[PDB]
Design a protein around this ligand. Structure first.
Ligand SMILES: Nc1ncnc2c1ncn2CCOCP(=O)(O)OP(=O)(O)OP(=O)(O)O
Ligand SMILES: [Ca+2]
Ligand SMILES: [Ca+2]
Ligand SMILES: [Mg+2]
Ligand SMILES: [Mg+2]
Ligand SMILES: [Mg+2]
Lengths: 69, 351
């Protein structure tokens, strides 16, 4: 149960580029860096899994959600 | 190689020490940013003078033969003709330091430093050892020095037409090694790959996701995707040292400030190189991104993970950080930068 300022610092790790959203490409980079080589399809699966609103990307509120466990 | 450009030379960091900094930054694949080191400290640091921790609030001196050191007599420090009410605020600072491991010590300079001082214009010749200076601090105090069959000179002084001389006292290590300023890191931008093992020891066991699943599960995979997000969460959480920044860390009996695990590694790796080159610990605490009293100097010395050095204005610093993040280097900012309208981030910045 991190605090809101705690979860935003972590969020910024994923959100490499400017904008406050995590794209599939930024997620593929994080995963490769953290030891997991994944396909475009696996990456799409992870983004879908977290993409509540269905816009193709993970925003801040959606991040806050599942980073529960 | 030593200094490779102007930046390095304006950094105030001794060359040998800087060589280690560039090597560490490459070994740990991390960009290291530092606040400028006062040039009067650069030479003390290299001949091995000790560096001060946060347990020392007394103020340094910028004049006389004592420049670069921290005087017990605040009238000898940068606070010369202040208010009597500040020599007091200053008097206490010093006292809080001697009650706690920090010692009182007779200032003695090396020959070389005596050169540096004279060549710097801080000390204007002397009698054959009776210094002169145009610092207002000389219109009230009288100075002189007496060498020793040790090659070092003992600094001594007295109050204007007010009679015996006496060795100037400076705050030293618990070990009595005198202290000069330390090298304040502005921040550390670790490349994200430095946290793979950290995320694995937290989520899997140390194992890759593929290995972990084969091992604990049995012959679209909801499980596998969840576990992938789990190491992603754990990776950033380690990278940003969320948990570690909740407490203070201590080095023996020295409060090290708030510092992440990786930042502690860097610190240790840096001080190791400093020792190998004749210096003592040069980084004594955490990064400015965790300093509650955020200071706003406007030039920052930067050493990239590739070894390249440069100076940066706050503005070139934003774009630099942005460029660096694009390459996978993680960065988090001092928590109080936003509320003052000085955040280096151009994102929503919120929830
Ligand atoms: N991570 C940290 N945690 C706590 N305090 C910190 C941290 N980083 C810096 N500080 C506090 C002061 O910064 C360093 P220090 O090396 O004392 O400065 P200084 O520039 O010599 O101060 P002075 O000019 O007021 O004497
Ligand atoms: Ca983004
Ligand atoms: Ca979305
Ligand atoms: Mg300080
Ligand atoms: Mg310091
Ligand atoms: Mg330091």
């Amino acid at each position: 149960t991190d605090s809101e300022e705690e979860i935003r610092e972590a969020f910024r790790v994923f959100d490499k580029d400017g904008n406050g959203y995590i794209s599939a490409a930024e997620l593929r980079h994080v995963m490769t860096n953290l030891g997991e080589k994944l396909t475009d399809e696996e990456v799409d699966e992870m983004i879908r899994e977290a993409d509540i609103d269905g816009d193709g990307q993970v925003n801040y509120e959606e991040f806050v959600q599942m980073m529960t466990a | 190689a030593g200094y490779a450009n102007a930046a390095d030379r304006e950094s105030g960091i001794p060359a040998a020490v800087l060589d280690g900094i560039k090597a560490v930054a490459k070994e740990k694949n991390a960009t290291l940013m530092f606040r400028l080191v006062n040039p009067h400290s650069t030479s003390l640091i290299a001949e091995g003078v000790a560096t001060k921790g946060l347990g020392v609030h007394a103020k340094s001196s910028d004049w006389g033969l004592q420049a670069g050191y921290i005087p017990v007599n605040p009238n000898l420090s940068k606070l010369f003709g202040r208010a009597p009410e500040v020599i007091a605020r200053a008097d206490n600072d010093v006292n809080s330091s001697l009650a706690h491991g920090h010692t009182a010590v007779d200032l003695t300079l090396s020959k070389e430093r005596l050169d540096y001082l004279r060549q710097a214009g801080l000390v204007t010749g002397m009698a054959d050892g009776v210094v002169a200076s145009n610092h207002a601090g000389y219109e009230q105090f009288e100075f002189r020095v007496k060498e020793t069959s040790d090659g070092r000179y003992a600094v001594q002084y007295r109050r204007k037409g007010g009679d015996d001389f006496e060795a100037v006292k400076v705050i030293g290590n618990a070990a009595g090694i005198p202290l000069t300023a330390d090298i304040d890191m502005f921040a550390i931008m670790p490349h994200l790959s430095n946290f793979r093992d950290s995320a694995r020891s937290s989520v899997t066991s140390g194992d890759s996701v593929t290995d972990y699943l084969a091992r604990t599960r049995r012959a679209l995979d909801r499980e596998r995707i969840d576990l992938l997000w789990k190491i992603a969460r754990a990776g950033a959480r380690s990278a940003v040292g969320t948990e570690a920044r909740r407490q203070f860390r201590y080095d023996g009996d020295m409060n090290i400030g708030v510092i992440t695990d990786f930042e502690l590694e860097v610190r240790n790796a840096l001080n190791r190189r400093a020792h190998a080159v004749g210096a003592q610990d040069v980084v004594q605490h955490g990064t400015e991104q965790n300093n509650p009293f955020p200071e706003a100097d406007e030039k920052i010395f930067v050493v990239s993970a590739t070894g390249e050095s440069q100076m940066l204005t706050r503005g070139q610093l934003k774009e630099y950080i942005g460029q660096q993040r694009g390459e996978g280097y993680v960065f988090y900012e001092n928590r109080a930068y936003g509320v003052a309208g000085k955040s280096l981030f151009d994102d929503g910045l919120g929830a």
